[PDB]
Short mmCIF file of C-alpha atoms and ligand atoms in Angstrom, two decimals:
data_model
loop_
_atom_site.label_atom_id
_atom_site.label_comp_id
_atom_site.label_asym_id
_atom_site.label_seq_id
_atom_site.Cartn_x
_atom_site.Cartn_y
_atom_site.Cartn_z
CA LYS P 1 -15.67 -14.79 10.19
CA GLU P 2 -13.87 -13.50 7.72
CA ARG P 3 -12.11 -10.57 8.86
CA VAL P 4 -11.65 -7.02 7.64
CA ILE P 5 -9.25 -4.15 7.58
CA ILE P 6 -10.91 -0.38 6.78
CA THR P 7 -7.43 2.09 6.40
CA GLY P 8 -8.76 5.41 6.25
CA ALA P 9 -11.72 4.86 8.64
CA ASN P 10 -12.93 8.42 9.80
CA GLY P 11 -13.74 9.89 6.29
CA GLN P 12 -16.36 9.51 4.35
CA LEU P 13 -16.37 6.27 4.47
CA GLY P 14 -15.07 3.81 6.22
CA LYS P 15 -16.86 5.89 8.32
CA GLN P 16 -19.43 4.85 7.01
CA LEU P 17 -18.67 1.79 5.62
CA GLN P 18 -17.31 0.65 8.81
CA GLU P 19 -21.59 0.84 9.85
CA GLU P 20 -22.24 -0.57 6.66
CA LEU P 21 -20.80 -4.27 6.83
CA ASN P 22 -22.42 -6.74 8.65
CA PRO P 23 -21.09 -7.16 12.07
CA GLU P 24 -21.77 -10.70 12.02
CA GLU P 25 -20.06 -12.10 9.56
CA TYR P 26 -16.78 -10.19 9.24
CA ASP P 27 -14.18 -8.61 12.20
CA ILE P 28 -14.63 -4.98 11.70
CA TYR P 29 -11.73 -4.05 12.51
CA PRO P 30 -10.25 0.38 11.46
CA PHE P 31 -7.76 2.38 11.69
CA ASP P 32 -7.44 6.25 12.06
CA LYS P 33 -4.84 8.13 10.24
CA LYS P 34 -2.94 7.35 13.89
CA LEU P 35 -3.21 3.99 14.08
CA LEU P 36 -2.20 2.85 10.41
CA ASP P 37 0.27 5.14 8.37
CA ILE P 38 -0.05 4.42 5.16
CA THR P 39 2.75 5.81 4.74
CA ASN P 40 4.97 3.91 6.96
CA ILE P 41 5.31 0.36 5.59
CA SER P 42 7.13 -1.60 8.50
CA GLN P 43 3.48 0.14 10.76
CA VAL P 44 1.75 -1.39 7.78
CA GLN P 45 3.31 -4.75 7.50
CA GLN P 46 2.98 -4.89 11.35
CA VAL P 47 -0.59 -4.38 11.94
CA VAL P 48 -1.45 -6.98 9.26
CA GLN P 49 -0.17 -9.27 10.02
CA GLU P 50 -0.99 -9.38 13.17
CA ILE P 51 -4.40 -9.85 12.39
CA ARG P 52 -3.32 -11.75 9.46
CA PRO P 53 -6.67 -9.66 7.19
CA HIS P 54 -9.04 -11.47 4.65
CA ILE P 55 -10.34 -8.64 2.75
CA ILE P 56 -8.91 -5.29 3.26
CA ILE P 57 -11.47 -1.92 1.66
CA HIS P 58 -8.44 1.14 1.80
CA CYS P 59 -10.22 3.87 2.11
CA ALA P 60 -7.95 5.91 2.79
CA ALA P 61 -6.26 8.68 0.60
CA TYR P 62 -5.06 12.67 0.11
CA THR P 63 -8.48 13.92 -1.05
CA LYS P 64 -8.02 17.53 -1.61
CA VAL P 65 -7.53 18.38 -4.92
CA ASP P 66 -7.38 22.07 -5.25
CA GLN P 67 -3.81 22.03 -2.69
CA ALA P 68 -2.91 18.73 -4.51
CA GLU P 69 -1.51 20.76 -7.07
CA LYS P 70 0.67 22.66 -4.16
CA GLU P 71 1.73 19.64 -2.74
CA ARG P 72 2.92 17.27 -5.60
CA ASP P 73 4.92 15.65 -3.57
CA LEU P 74 2.27 14.99 -0.37
CA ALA P 75 -0.37 13.55 -3.14
CA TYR P 76 1.87 10.96 -3.73
CA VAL P 77 3.72 9.47 -0.90
CA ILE P 78 -0.23 9.25 0.54
CA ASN P 79 -1.59 7.98 -2.80
CA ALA P 80 0.63 6.77 -4.67
CA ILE P 81 3.22 5.23 -1.77
CA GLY P 82 0.85 4.44 0.33
CA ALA P 83 -1.18 2.06 -2.07
CA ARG P 84 2.25 0.89 -2.81
CA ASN P 85 2.50 -0.50 0.80
CA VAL P 86 -0.40 -1.61 1.04
CA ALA P 87 -0.84 -3.42 -1.97
CA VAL P 88 2.72 -5.17 -0.23
CA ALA P 89 1.22 -6.25 3.10
CA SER P 90 -1.77 -7.81 1.82
CA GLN P 91 -0.12 -9.88 -1.04
CA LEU P 92 2.07 -11.33 2.48
CA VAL P 93 -1.23 -12.73 3.43
CA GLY P 94 -3.51 -13.03 0.24
CA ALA P 95 -5.95 -10.93 1.03
CA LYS P 96 -8.16 -9.58 -1.43
CA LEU P 97 -7.74 -6.03 -2.10
CA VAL P 98 -10.47 -3.22 -2.65
CA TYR P 99 -8.95 0.15 -3.81
CA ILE P 100 -10.97 2.89 -4.27
CA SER P 101 -10.66 5.22 -7.14
CA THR P 102 -11.31 8.70 -8.94
CA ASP P 103 -12.95 9.50 -12.09
CA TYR P 104 -9.68 11.68 -12.94
CA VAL P 105 -7.80 9.71 -14.21
CA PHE P 106 -9.43 11.07 -17.72
CA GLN P 107 -9.90 14.25 -19.24
CA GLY P 108 -13.72 13.80 -18.29
CA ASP P 109 -14.11 15.29 -21.88
CA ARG P 110 -16.55 12.83 -23.25
CA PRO P 111 -20.24 12.95 -22.67
CA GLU P 112 -20.95 8.88 -22.44
CA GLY P 113 -17.99 8.21 -20.64
CA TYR P 114 -14.94 5.63 -20.47
CA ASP P 115 -15.22 1.90 -20.08
CA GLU P 116 -12.69 0.36 -17.40
CA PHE P 117 -11.05 -0.99 -20.75
CA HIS P 118 -10.27 2.60 -22.08
CA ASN P 119 -6.35 4.48 -20.80
CA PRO P 120 -6.19 6.27 -18.27
CA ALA P 121 -5.76 9.83 -18.81
CA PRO P 122 -5.39 12.30 -15.49
CA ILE P 123 -5.98 15.67 -15.26
CA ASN P 124 -5.06 16.43 -12.82
CA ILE P 125 -2.34 15.81 -9.56
CA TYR P 126 -4.63 14.42 -7.82
CA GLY P 127 -5.78 11.92 -11.23
CA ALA P 128 -2.40 10.83 -11.80
CA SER P 129 -1.44 10.14 -7.55
CA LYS P 130 -4.48 7.63 -7.78
CA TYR P 131 -3.51 6.67 -11.10
CA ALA P 132 -0.39 5.64 -9.60
CA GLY P 133 -1.84 4.19 -6.87
CA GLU P 134 -4.16 2.14 -9.07
CA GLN P 135 -0.71 0.65 -11.43
CA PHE P 136 1.84 0.13 -7.99
CA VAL P 137 -1.24 -2.23 -6.44
CA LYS P 138 -1.99 -4.41 -10.13
CA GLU P 139 1.71 -4.80 -10.51
CA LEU P 140 1.78 -5.63 -7.08
CA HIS P 141 -1.05 -7.58 -6.15
CA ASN P 142 -3.35 -10.19 -8.41
CA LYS P 143 -5.95 -10.38 -5.55
CA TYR P 144 -7.77 -7.07 -5.96
CA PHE P 145 -10.34 -4.68 -7.00
CA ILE P 146 -10.00 -1.29 -8.53
CA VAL P 147 -13.58 0.62 -7.51
CA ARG P 148 -13.43 3.83 -9.85
CA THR P 149 -16.02 6.94 -8.25
CA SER P 150 -16.54 9.60 -8.36
CA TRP P 151 -19.00 12.93 -6.51
CA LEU P 152 -18.86 10.73 -3.15
CA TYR P 153 -21.32 11.69 -0.68
CA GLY P 154 -22.82 10.11 3.19
CA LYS P 155 -23.63 11.36 6.50
CA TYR P 156 -20.41 12.21 8.23
CA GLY P 157 -18.29 15.02 7.83
CA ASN P 158 -19.05 18.01 4.79
CA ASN P 159 -20.24 17.54 1.21
CA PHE P 160 -22.35 19.20 -1.04
CA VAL P 161 -25.08 18.13 -0.15
CA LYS P 162 -24.90 19.28 3.93
CA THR P 163 -23.51 22.79 2.48
CA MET P 164 -26.51 23.45 0.03
CA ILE P 165 -28.94 22.98 2.61
CA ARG P 166 -26.72 24.47 5.53
CA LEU P 167 -26.26 27.34 4.12
CA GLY P 168 -30.20 27.55 1.30
CA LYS P 169 -31.33 28.48 5.06
CA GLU P 170 -30.41 31.85 5.20
CA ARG P 171 -30.09 32.25 1.48
CA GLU P 172 -32.38 33.57 -0.98
CA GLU P 173 -30.04 32.99 -3.30
CA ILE P 174 -27.08 30.64 -3.90
CA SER P 175 -24.83 30.69 -7.41
CA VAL P 176 -23.44 27.13 -8.30
CA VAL P 177 -21.48 25.94 -10.94
CA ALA P 178 -23.20 24.53 -13.99
CA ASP P 179 -21.07 23.93 -16.85
CA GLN P 180 -19.30 20.27 -15.33
CA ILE P 181 -21.40 17.65 -15.15
CA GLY P 182 -21.47 14.80 -13.21
CA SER P 183 -22.60 11.64 -11.22
CA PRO P 184 -23.85 12.31 -7.38
CA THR P 185 -22.43 9.07 -5.79
CA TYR P 186 -24.26 8.26 -2.79
CA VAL P 187 -21.85 6.39 0.20
CA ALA P 188 -24.46 4.12 0.83
CA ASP P 189 -25.18 2.16 -3.05
CA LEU P 190 -21.71 2.80 -3.20
CA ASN P 191 -21.03 0.84 0.27
CA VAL P 192 -23.46 -1.86 -1.49
CA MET P 193 -21.49 -2.88 -3.63
CA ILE P 194 -18.38 -2.83 -2.53
CA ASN P 195 -20.04 -5.30 -0.24
CA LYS P 196 -21.47 -7.20 -3.60
CA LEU P 197 -17.74 -7.57 -4.81
CA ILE P 198 -15.62 -8.59 -1.56
CA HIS P 199 -17.53 -11.60 -1.43
CA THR P 200 -16.85 -12.89 -5.15
CA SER P 201 -13.57 -13.86 -6.60
CA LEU P 202 -14.07 -11.38 -10.09
CA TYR P 203 -10.84 -8.79 -8.90
CA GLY P 204 -10.78 -5.74 -11.76
CA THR P 205 -10.95 -2.31 -12.66
CA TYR P 206 -14.91 -1.29 -11.87
CA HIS P 207 -16.46 1.53 -12.51
CA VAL P 208 -19.24 2.05 -9.13
CA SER P 209 -21.34 5.02 -9.46
CA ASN P 210 -25.44 5.98 -9.22
CA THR P 211 -27.00 6.38 -13.03
CA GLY P 212 -27.25 9.10 -14.58
CA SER P 213 -25.40 12.48 -15.53
CA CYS P 214 -26.04 15.28 -13.55
CA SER P 215 -24.77 19.23 -12.77
CA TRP P 216 -23.98 21.58 -9.78
CA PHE P 217 -26.50 23.31 -10.70
CA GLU P 218 -29.31 21.34 -10.66
CA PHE P 219 -28.55 18.94 -8.97
CA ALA P 220 -28.46 21.58 -6.18
CA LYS P 221 -32.02 22.16 -6.97
CA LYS P 222 -33.54 18.65 -7.04
CA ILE P 223 -31.30 18.94 -3.10
CA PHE P 224 -33.92 22.09 -2.32
CA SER P 225 -36.88 19.96 -4.12
CA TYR P 226 -36.33 17.64 -1.63
CA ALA P 227 -35.54 19.34 1.60
CA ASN P 228 -38.31 21.05 -0.25
CA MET P 229 -36.40 25.03 0.29
CA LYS P 230 -37.75 27.68 -0.98
CA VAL P 231 -34.41 28.66 -2.82
CA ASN P 232 -33.37 30.27 -5.64
CA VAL P 233 -29.98 29.11 -8.08
CA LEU P 234 -27.92 30.77 -10.31
CA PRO P 235 -25.70 28.92 -12.92
CA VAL P 236 -22.28 30.13 -12.90
CA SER P 237 -19.44 29.36 -15.13
CA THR P 238 -16.12 27.30 -13.77
CA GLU P 239 -14.04 30.82 -14.45
CA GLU P 240 -15.78 32.25 -12.17
CA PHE P 241 -16.01 29.96 -9.64
CA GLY P 242 -11.86 30.72 -9.59
CA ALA P 243 -10.45 26.94 -9.32
CA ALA P 244 -7.08 25.95 -7.95
CA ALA P 245 -7.55 22.29 -9.63
CA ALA P 246 -9.03 21.62 -12.84
CA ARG P 247 -11.67 19.40 -13.20
CA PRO P 248 -13.54 18.16 -16.09
CA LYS P 249 -16.24 18.82 -18.22
CA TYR P 250 -17.92 15.37 -17.77
CA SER P 251 -17.45 13.35 -15.28
CA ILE P 252 -19.19 10.05 -16.20
CA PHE P 253 -18.41 6.47 -16.37
CA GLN P 254 -19.78 3.85 -18.42
CA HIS P 255 -20.79 0.98 -16.02
CA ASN P 256 -19.21 -2.58 -18.42
CA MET P 257 -17.74 -5.07 -15.69
CA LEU P 258 -20.71 -3.54 -13.18
CA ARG P 259 -23.07 -5.15 -16.31
CA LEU P 260 -20.39 -8.03 -17.70
CA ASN P 261 -20.06 -8.77 -14.60
CA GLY P 262 -23.46 -10.34 -13.66
CA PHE P 263 -24.24 -7.75 -11.02
CA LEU P 264 -27.08 -5.82 -10.82
CA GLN P 265 -26.86 -1.93 -12.49
CA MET P 266 -26.72 0.84 -9.94
CA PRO P 267 -29.70 3.31 -8.68
CA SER P 268 -29.92 6.69 -10.35
CA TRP P 269 -27.68 9.39 -8.45
CA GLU P 270 -31.34 11.06 -8.46
CA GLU P 271 -32.62 8.35 -6.48
CA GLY P 272 -29.13 7.93 -4.65
CA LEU P 273 -29.94 10.88 -2.76
CA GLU P 274 -33.76 9.85 -1.65
CA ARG P 275 -31.95 7.60 0.72
CA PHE P 276 -30.13 10.31 2.08
CA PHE P 277 -32.36 11.98 3.47
CA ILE P 278 -34.61 8.92 4.33
CA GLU P 279 -31.52 7.77 6.57
CA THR P 280 -30.07 10.90 8.28
CA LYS P 281 -34.03 12.76 8.96
N1 LIG M 1 -15.29 13.13 -3.45
C1 LIG M 1 -15.12 12.44 -4.14
O1 LIG M 1 -15.34 12.17 -1.76
C2 LIG M 1 -14.42 11.32 -4.38
C3 LIG M 1 -14.31 10.39 -5.42
C4 LIG M 1 -13.60 10.28 -6.49
C5 LIG M 1 -12.56 9.95 -5.54
N2 LIG M 1 -13.20 9.73 -4.31
C6 LIG M 1 -12.02 8.62 -3.58
O2 LIG M 1 -13.05 7.49 -2.18
C7 LIG M 1 -11.69 7.33 -1.24
C8 LIG M 1 -12.80 7.46 0.18
O3 LIG M 1 -12.56 8.62 0.64
P1 LIG M 1 -13.19 9.37 1.30
O4 LIG M 1 -14.45 10.03 0.36
O5 LIG M 1 -13.89 9.30 3.06
O6 LIG M 1 -12.64 11.24 1.75
P2 LIG M 1 -11.88 11.63 2.99
O7 LIG M 1 -13.10 11.64 3.83
O8 LIG M 1 -11.19 12.46 2.73
O9 LIG M 1 -11.31 10.06 3.75
C9 LIG M 1 -9.61 9.97 3.35
C10 LIG M 1 -9.01 9.64 5.56
O10 LIG M 1 -8.06 9.17 4.64
C11 LIG M 1 -7.39 9.29 5.83
N3 LIG M 1 -6.24 9.31 5.72
C12 LIG M 1 -4.24 10.57 5.39
N4 LIG M 1 -3.95 10.08 4.92
C13 LIG M 1 -3.61 8.89 5.66
C14 LIG M 1 -2.62 8.10 5.93
N5 LIG M 1 -1.11 8.79 5.37
N6 LIG M 1 -2.97 7.13 6.40
C15 LIG M 1 -3.66 6.33 6.51
N7 LIG M 1 -4.92 7.35 7.10
C16 LIG M 1 -4.83 8.52 5.96
C17 LIG M 1 -7.96 10.48 6.18
O11 LIG M 1 -7.97 11.69 7.82
P3 LIG M 1 -7.46 13.06 7.52
O12 LIG M 1 -8.62 12.72 6.71
O13 LIG M 1 -7.33 12.56 9.16
O14 LIG M 1 -6.13 13.21 7.52
C18 LIG M 1 -9.07 10.94 5.89
O15 LIG M 1 -10.54 11.08 6.83
C19 LIG M 1 -10.73 8.20 -1.54
O16 LIG M 1 -9.29 6.73 -1.70
C20 LIG M 1 -10.82 9.65 -2.77
O17 LIG M 1 -9.36 9.18 -3.58
C21 LIG M 1 -13.78 9.87 -3.81
#
């Protein structure tokens, strides 16, 4: 009857991960920002000592990509220092640590993607802050799973899929960026993989995302395809959209670690999106 702590339980993952972990196997201890402030080490240790968990799924993070450029110290304090504090505590209790990371740790300029062994080169403050976060984890703990994902969206909270369906009903046409390729990842599919990793000790860095490349534009079209909504999508560039943070033109991962560790391949983003509508009918 293992114990699992989830940091940042109110976010997209925490909110949905908390519901997908089998309760008749683990004692799920979710914590919000106020009940477990990642930036307060004294508090982090108190909570981790008392509950003393076997597993810790660290979802807490500052996910404001654009504003990250204007508030750098705040990006690091949360993403870097925060991961360092949770790392320390994880070590004192000997808990397996799952650190969720991103594809912004790379330049994202290669169409085929990057494997878990290529040296990262953060493209923006957000990416750099979590890379620093990953390093404190490897440096201060020895039972972890660095899970990099991208274009994550789930049942709870606002996301690109809910926005299209919301705006789609009112518009006759809608313009979406089409010069940024990526791979939409549905939380449910990610959680399934996280769940598989926590039952083992195959520690390391893993890229978990849905299969196939895509683009907000093509993704947008297919969202309306399954939604069965007749609306047009106009392809626009990044310069006309005006971005305060520099996204990559190719944010795709190579799924080596999963394939090298006997795990099966993730479903396609196309297929990951299907189960989204099915579950949120
Ligand atoms: N497209 C994506 O979303 C994407 C892509 C790549 C990687 N990731 C990573 O995936 C992970 C999952 O995050 P998400 O997608 O669920 O985004 P999210 O909804 O913003 O989740 C992050 C949560 O952490 C909380 N938090 C902020 N400061 C905290 C603190 N000091 N202590 C504890 N919690 C704090 C936030 O609460 P408040 O909002 O109330 O402050 C928020 O609920 C993140 O670590 C993110 O870096 C996400």
